[PDB]
Design an enzyme around this catalytic site. Sequence first.
Site, PDB file in Angstrom:
ATOM      1  N   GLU A  25       1.342  -1.109  -0.245  1.00  0.00           N
ATOM      2  CA  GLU A  25       0.281  -0.285   0.149  1.00  0.00           C
ATOM      3  C   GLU A  25       0.906   1.073  -0.197  1.00  0.00           C
ATOM      4  O   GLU A  25       0.593   1.925  -1.040  1.00  0.00           O
ATOM      5  CB  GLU A  25      -0.669  -0.034   0.958  1.00  0.00           C
ATOM      6  CG  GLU A  25      -1.313   1.351   1.705  1.00  0.00           C
ATOM      7  CD  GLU A  25      -3.063   1.237   2.174  1.00  0.00           C
ATOM      8  OE1 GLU A  25      -2.580   0.062   2.958  1.00  0.00           O
ATOM      9  OE2 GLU A  25      -3.494   2.017   1.674  1.00  0.00           O
ATOM     10  N   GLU A  45       2.374   1.377  -3.796  1.00  0.00           N
ATOM     11  CA  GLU A  45       1.220   2.317  -4.328  1.00  0.00           C
ATOM     12  C   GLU A  45       1.254   3.901  -4.359  1.00  0.00           C
ATOM     13  O   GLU A  45       0.347   4.246  -5.163  1.00  0.00           O
ATOM     14  CB  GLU A  45       0.030   1.260  -4.733  1.00  0.00           C
ATOM     15  CG  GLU A  45      -0.895   1.213  -3.153  1.00  0.00           C
ATOM     16  CD  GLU A  45      -1.787   0.205  -3.228  1.00  0.00           C
ATOM     17  OE1 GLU A  45      -2.299  -0.173  -4.228  1.00  0.00           O
ATOM     18  OE2 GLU A  45      -3.114   0.247  -1.734  1.00  0.00           O
ATOM     19  N   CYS A  76      -8.015  -2.256   4.614  1.00  0.00           N
ATOM     20  CA  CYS A  76      -7.902  -3.005   5.218  1.00  0.00           C
ATOM     21  C   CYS A  76      -9.342  -3.436   6.224  1.00  0.00           C
ATOM     22  O   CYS A  76      -8.807  -4.674   7.041  1.00  0.00           O
ATOM     23  CB  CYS A  76      -7.082  -2.610   6.566  1.00  0.00           C
ATOM     24  SG  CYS A  76      -6.740  -1.278   6.801  1.00  0.00           S
ATOM     25  N   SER A 113      -7.980   2.021  -1.698  1.00  0.00           N
ATOM     26  CA  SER A 113      -6.304   0.534  -2.551  1.00  0.00           C
ATOM     27  C   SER A 113      -7.021  -0.169  -2.499  1.00  0.00           C
ATOM     28  O   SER A 113      -7.315  -1.650  -1.806  1.00  0.00           O
ATOM     29  CB  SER A 113      -5.129   0.928  -0.520  1.00  0.00           C
ATOM     30  OG  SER A 113      -4.080  -0.259  -1.545  1.00  0.00           O
ATOM     31  N   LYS A 158     -14.771  -9.784   8.908  1.00  0.00           N
ATOM     32  CA  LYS A 158     -13.577 -10.341   8.115  1.00  0.00           C
ATOM     33  C   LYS A 158     -14.878 -11.310   7.976  1.00  0.00           C
ATOM     34  O   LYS A 158     -14.094 -12.301   7.183  1.00  0.00           O
ATOM     35  CB  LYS A 158     -11.954 -10.898   9.320  1.00  0.00           C
ATOM     36  CG  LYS A 158     -11.942  -9.587   9.589  1.00  0.00           C
ATOM     37  CD  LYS A 158     -10.989  -9.404   8.561  1.00  0.00           C
ATOM     38  CE  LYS A 158      -9.680  -8.046   8.669  1.00  0.00           C
ATOM     39  NZ  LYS A 158      -9.580  -7.378   7.870  1.00  0.00           N
ATOM     40  N   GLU A 218     -16.115 -10.525   4.333  1.00  0.00           N
ATOM     41  CA  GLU A 218     -14.776 -10.934   3.634  1.00  0.00           C
ATOM     42  C   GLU A 218     -14.325 -12.495   3.104  1.00  0.00           C
ATOM     43  O   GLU A 218     -14.031 -12.485   1.898  1.00  0.00           O
ATOM     44  CB  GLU A 218     -13.855  -9.595   3.812  1.00  0.00           C
ATOM     45  CG  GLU A 218     -12.972  -9.370   3.479  1.00  0.00           C
ATOM     46  CD  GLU A 218     -11.462  -9.584   3.649  1.00  0.00           C
ATOM     47  OE1 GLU A 218     -11.277  -9.523   4.737  1.00  0.00           O
ATOM     48  OE2 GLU A 218     -10.332  -8.650   2.738  1.00  0.00           O
ATOM     49  N   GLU A 246     -15.209 -12.319  -4.185  1.00  0.00           N
ATOM     50  CA  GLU A 246     -13.412 -12.084  -4.862  1.00  0.00           C
ATOM     51  C   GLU A 246     -12.424 -12.817  -4.325  1.00  0.00           C
ATOM     52  O   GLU A 246     -11.485 -13.421  -4.719  1.00  0.00           O
ATOM     53  CB  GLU A 246     -13.344 -10.571  -4.594  1.00  0.00           C
ATOM     54  CG  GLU A 246     -13.970  -9.122  -5.309  1.00  0.00           C
ATOM     55  CD  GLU A 246     -15.240  -8.916  -4.683  1.00  0.00           C
ATOM     56  OE1 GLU A 246     -15.297 -10.090  -3.736  1.00  0.00           O
ATOM     57  OE2 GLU A 246     -16.375  -8.848  -4.866  1.00  0.00           O
ATOM     58  N   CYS A 300      -8.807  -1.977  15.337  1.00  0.00           N
ATOM     59  CA  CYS A 300      -9.841  -3.853  15.655  1.00  0.00           C
ATOM     60  C   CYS A 300      -9.627  -4.161  17.539  1.00  0.00           C
ATOM     61  O   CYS A 300     -10.377  -5.332  17.537  1.00  0.00           O
ATOM     62  CB  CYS A 300      -8.698  -4.916  14.969  1.00  0.00           C
ATOM     63  SG  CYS A 300      -9.351  -3.833  13.204  1.00  0.00           S
TER      64      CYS A 300
HETATM   65  S1  SF4 Z   1     -12.653  -4.817  13.651  1.00  0.00           S
HETATM   66 FE1  SF4 Z   1     -13.196  -2.967  13.019  1.00  0.00          FE
HETATM   67  S2  SF4 Z   1     -11.855  -1.518  12.953  1.00  0.00           S
HETATM   68 FE2  SF4 Z   1     -10.812  -3.875  13.075  1.00  0.00          FE
HETATM   69  S3  SF4 Z   1     -11.283  -4.874  10.497  1.00  0.00           S
HETATM   70 FE3  SF4 Z   1     -12.986  -5.474  11.738  1.00  0.00          FE
HETATM   71  S4  SF4 Z   1     -14.626  -3.978  11.454  1.00  0.00           S
HETATM   72 FE4  SF4 Z   1     -13.034  -2.784  11.144  1.00  0.00          FE
END
Ligand code: SF4
Lengths: 311, 553, 642
Positions: B274, B277, B294, B314, B353, B356, B361, B486
Amino acid sequence: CGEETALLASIEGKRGMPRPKPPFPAQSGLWGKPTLINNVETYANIPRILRDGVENYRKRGTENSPGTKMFSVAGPLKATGIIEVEFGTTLRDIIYNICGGFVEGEEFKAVQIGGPSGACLSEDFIDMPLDYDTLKKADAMVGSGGIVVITKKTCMVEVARFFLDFTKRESCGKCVPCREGTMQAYNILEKFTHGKATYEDLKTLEHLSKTIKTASLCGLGKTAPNPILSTLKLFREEYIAHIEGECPSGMCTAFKKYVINPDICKGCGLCARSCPQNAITGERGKPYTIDQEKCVKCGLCASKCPFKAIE
Amino acid sequence: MKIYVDGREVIINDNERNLLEALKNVGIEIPNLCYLSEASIYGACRMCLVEINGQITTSCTLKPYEGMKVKTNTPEIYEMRRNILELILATHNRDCTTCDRNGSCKLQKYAEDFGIRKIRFEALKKEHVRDESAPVVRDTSKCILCGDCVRVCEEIQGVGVIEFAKRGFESVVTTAFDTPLIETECVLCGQCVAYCPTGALSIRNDIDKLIEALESDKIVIGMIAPAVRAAIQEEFGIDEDVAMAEKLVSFLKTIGFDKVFDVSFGADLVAYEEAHEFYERLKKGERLPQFTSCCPAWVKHAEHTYPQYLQNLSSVKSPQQALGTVIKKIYARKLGVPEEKIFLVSFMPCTAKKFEAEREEHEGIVDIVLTTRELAQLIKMSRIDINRVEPQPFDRPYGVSSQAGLGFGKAGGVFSCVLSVLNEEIGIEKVDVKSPEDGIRVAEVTLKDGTSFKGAVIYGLGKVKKFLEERKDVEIIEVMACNYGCVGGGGQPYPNDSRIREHRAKVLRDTMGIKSLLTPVENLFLMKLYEEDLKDEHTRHEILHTTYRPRRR
Amino acid sequence: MKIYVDGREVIINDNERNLLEALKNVGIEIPNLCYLSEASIYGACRMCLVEINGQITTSCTLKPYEGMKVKTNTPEIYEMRRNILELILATHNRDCTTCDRNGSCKLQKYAEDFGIRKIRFEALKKEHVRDESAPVVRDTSKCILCGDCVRVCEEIQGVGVIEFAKRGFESVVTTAFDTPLIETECVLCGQCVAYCPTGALSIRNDIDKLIEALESDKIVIGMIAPAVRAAIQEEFGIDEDVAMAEKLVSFLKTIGFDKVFDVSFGADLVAYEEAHEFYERLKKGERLPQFTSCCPAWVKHAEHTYPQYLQNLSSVKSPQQALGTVIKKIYARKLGVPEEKIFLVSFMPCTAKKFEAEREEHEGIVDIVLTTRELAQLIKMSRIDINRVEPQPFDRPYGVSSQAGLGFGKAGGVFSCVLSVLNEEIGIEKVDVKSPEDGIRVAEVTLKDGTSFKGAVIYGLGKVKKFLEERKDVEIIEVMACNYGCVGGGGQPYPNDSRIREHRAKVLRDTMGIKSLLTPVENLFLMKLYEEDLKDEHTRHEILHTTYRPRRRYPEKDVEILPVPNGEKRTVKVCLGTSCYTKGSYEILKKLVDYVKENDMEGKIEVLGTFCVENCGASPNVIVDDKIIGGATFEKVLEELS
Ligand code: SF4
Ligand SMILES: Cc1cc2nc3c(=O)[nH]c(=O)nc-3n(C[C@H](O)[C@H](O)[C@H](O)COP(=O)(O)O)c2cc1C
Ligand code: SF4
Ligand code: SF4
Ligand code: SF4
Ligand code: SF4
Ligand code: SF4
Ligand code: SF4
Ligand code: SF4
Ligand code: SF4
Ligand code: SF4
Ligand code: SF4
Ligand code: FES
Ligand code: FES
Ligand code: FES
Ligand SMILES: [Zn+2]
């Protein structure tokens, strides 16, 4: 939305949820600005007062309740409509002179004066001047101004059930007491009107009514059990009759029916012992069938059925 | 202020909003079900009733004055409180064994304390709503309608996808038209779950899959997020350990994990890519400001709300996905094994996550994602005293990371690591960090050879809208959906309020303090990876770069 | 002996019974649902699986041998343990909010730790039993069939009223024929409840009655038992505390109690009366050996088991009933208020006191009995820091008591109080105490004049049988149904193991230590009560004495074919034994069933079935109006029915 805070919330385009009143709307209302809220009839009185003198306005009414009050009278009567009576007029005068008595075949049992938030009145309170202070010191209130006469062919347990159904529907669902207790009291009243009640249910209803009255956030919940409390205080006998029998007025039983529940009926005897019409003719050992053809709805089967199945 | 409580002398503070708070501060506690989280408000439970001048009233909306007598406990108050609790319990879904709040539920504790052993109130039938479409699981049968989740989603997160619907006994907190959560604009940050006092809002548990994979013949490989190691200690009621990650490695190896890797390695990789770039973008000044990608919750929020900024995001995938792709596309080859033979497990502090890992993708890279609470559940299953476990290092060659890489777990980690990479490659003259408000920090960064540029760190979704509207002079914006980063993720141990998140941030900072490597360039395994497998720019793009598309119902 | 656990060196112990206990001693915990109380055994949960030499086996039945490699955590073991827990939870009645073990249930804690959030198995239905006829409530839908209650009732209490029945999925711990516990020989000691690890066995909660009474206009009067103050401190996670009773008084007065008294005063009064009764019995040498009547569980056990010893039971009623009768019959008159106006609340550590308060001989004296747990719930509802509560003394004149009276709360209390009373009235030259067994103590007592006797103290029911069978050299026997006396009562805080009971006894001893007056006679209020109120023997007998009646089952439990719930009827019963079945009995039964099928519209006729009536070799027998016919046939039963 008749609540002041809920009214202001609805005017702002939000859910009409009332809120606690440390910041009364007089100091902070719409978008936090001072807001004056009044009824339609108050704004109607204002110009009349200003046009006249103060004493000229007080000529009619009472010292503590000067002026008049526009009422709407419903129920079976020779004439029902909007009436205007000076404060201090008794309910007997309104019901018999201004409204011209009851239609033939209809009698007087009770009269509601403020809808769900009002109270039930009987023949003892029929002759009594209508004043805010007097009704307050009579376990009643003037109410919003709506009056409905109750005859002898209607059931007061049904009246309380109807008012609690309305309140249960209209509760905003914000605070636990109103939201849950109104539904629970309505369920208890449904049990009462279906012959499924008990003395424990009556005790539960009384204590729940007190809890809802005291712990509710706003006036809707606070006055939600008012019909229950008044109707109990004045027709405990009708409640008992529903507990240990049928409807004294037949209203609950007039449009209802008795059905033997085969699920929990083992075909014992009884039933036929009391029934004058012998509307049983069951099969011994197997579930019994109630003959709706000659059922006068006396309700004696339920009175004595060890395995309670007279639904 | 001199007030009397149950006929005695009590001293409360002069300026108190209500009597309940004052009594709480002095030491007197009054039962209630309104104060449940940081987004709590008063007036709904109606359980704080007190006796004043002969009239019963709630103490949360009562102004304390001088010399007042309050009976905090009276038989009438006893009956009213028990009636209210029974009213709540009659319609509540009383099944605690299969609830995430079991053992940490205020309603459960009151049901125990109040001696409620029966319910004379009928269990009325409610049109309850159960949802399991998204990692965030909804169950309105456990909802007490406190409204904390609504406030969290609207005021704190700025999404407002859940809101009070209907009225009366049918009042329910739900999405518009009972739409499934995965089909709404919900970013799956899981903050509503973090604030929910009941099991109504919960995280989808996935331990069954993990056990199935471990029992199979697949090569189960685990990777631990930087912020997981700074909060897992709370679930065990023990003090923060600076070597907790190594203990987790040991424990996972015991239960049958072939390899355990540190996601901080992926953080270093992502920061390196990152930074490169973004420096190129600065050179030619295209697609600015650059936004970090992220945080998957922020990515989804951008896809829903900012379709014009998608090209500004990004292209580098988040550390989880970058490290997982590296594993299954390079490590699997150097082991002479097929990719399907590997079962990549991710231990994250985030509920987004999970979404994700299931995105089109990245489908098929990360097999399962488990939150900190799920890892704590596994450890509790084993009954192994984690404090007494012998730590061992992460597996090679993705087991080490620099301080900056491990800094991703808290807000300002990716920005700090990118600045570190720049300083290593293109030196930095001075950084003028500014703090316009609580959740936003703007820094002026001037490089040795060239001009300067403003960088912004924004933790907590909801501040982004106002910041982006007002501000038009920053070149890089770093967005974290959860307050404090996080460490405050929705998958973190419960309860997680501001103080807990600050403590977690300090634990992470202490953990970073002991790392010898300072910058991603120093990390030798990362340089080896770049000069052995990611040499070709085409490979770098197809292994570390992802794409984004707009979302519109 | 050194072993390998998960690959690390571990030193367990020289000699151990099984790997599980050895590792637990080391400090290595293996999840299991077998060790649940002191009456627990190993082998049923199957959750302690470990791997050794490749094959999985239970660690509770594996002997640890030197140099053994054991893996306590493998994916297979995780799968198996989660499967077993899900199996347990699938059929378990999962309503923890209304459960009595909420917050102190091992199964609930495991469900939390194992992350069980969905039931992969069907919540299949069982023929569950819900018994609420006695202060001990049974709900088999929460039963995990650990068997602790059965062992407690049989091996520890010696009653054996609850046992395993049926098998397979229908396995259930229940009474014989699902009989209500109130109608069995259950003594209601509550030890099964004290040992039960789930909510299947619980105490009947009566807090609602107390609250509705406090809300009413009646004068609520409370009295606390000596052993309640020695154990209530456990529920709040705090250490021993003398003066607990006085802060309890403060709290009770705060919640609306008009008067709070001490049951220790009643204990002293009972001890005085029992001492004089026992002295009269000795000097007349009749009705010996004497039995104490302070334990209602022992009284009910004697009524069920020793109808011959019912005359040897002390006539004096228990401290609860004695003090309650004194209140209702004397204090009400002294206060000039009708007895209907007083609501008497008893705070006890015993579940059998609830039964005693409802006895036909004690009707209307004690209104409600609340256990120690129920009082703790009362305290927790208020949310006041009971530790910070300022103590105040018990109300007069029934607030003070002697050390001997407060000693009633543990085994050997009433005997010691009686000995102190006798010593004060007539000195005791010497007391020689022996310890034949763990829960049996025999004292050799010689009076000043020279008349000597042997008194025995037995705590823990089930030890009485052998002592009564083999020992006949005693004149007075103290029997306490629960081990350690009332400090280990059924209504005490959970867990209720022996270590906690010994700590409770130590706390009660410390509380006794700070008592100035040492014997009941030094209690001036008690002597006053005798002087102005119990002067004559007539009122003393009507106030402090009771009667005991034998208990025998009266089960008819005959086959119901076409029963009639109630009302005047004929109740025809047909014998269904093999001898009668040999010719016509069943066919006659068919005739009668069809007759009441076509006739008997109402419940006039009750076609019923009964077993052999001891009239064999006399043709089929059919009962009519509880009369014997013989040679029965449809026409004969018809004519008799006419
Ligand atoms: S814990 Fe909260 S800030 Fe961290 S990646 Fe997950 S949603 Fe984003
Ligand atoms: C459930 C509820 C409904 C109400 N409805 C009305 C209404 O319909 N009209 C009205 O004037 N006041 C209504 N009120 C009274 C208002 O809450 C408030 O008292 C009002 O400002 C009084 O107006 P006034 O001063 O003109 O009488 C209602 C109150 C409650 C609690
Ligand atoms: S009392 Fe009823 S209407 Fe008023 S705030 Fe509470 S729930 Fe809403
Ligand atoms: S009395 Fe009741 S149980 Fe008996 S036959 Fe009639 S309905 Fe059935
Ligand atoms: S309700 Fe009365 S009339 Fe009707 S079937 Fe029953 S007993 Fe007969
Ligand atoms: S929220 Fe969950 S733990 Fe709390 S009472 Fe409800 S079911 Fe039990
Ligand atoms: S996960 Fe975040 S965006 Fe989704 S409903 Fe909860 S608070 Fe709102
Ligand atoms: S879902 Fe949870 S946070 Fe939201 S209102 Fe219900 S109980 Fe409160
Ligand atoms: S025994 Fe009671 S507390 Fe334990 S799991 Fe069952 S219902 Fe819940
Ligand atoms: S209370 Fe005592 S006698 Fe009754 S079942 Fe339980 S252990 Fe047995
Ligand atoms: S009733 Fe309780 S002690 Fe008895 S077997 Fe069931 S769970 Fe065990
Ligand atoms: S020993 Fe005490 S607690 Fe146990 S049954 Fe007897 S009186 Fe009750
Ligand atoms: S604290 Fe909930 S209404 Fe007062
Ligand atoms: S401990 Fe239960 S079977 Fe071994
Ligand atoms: S079998 Fe009928 S009398 Fe014995
Ligand atoms: Zn009716």
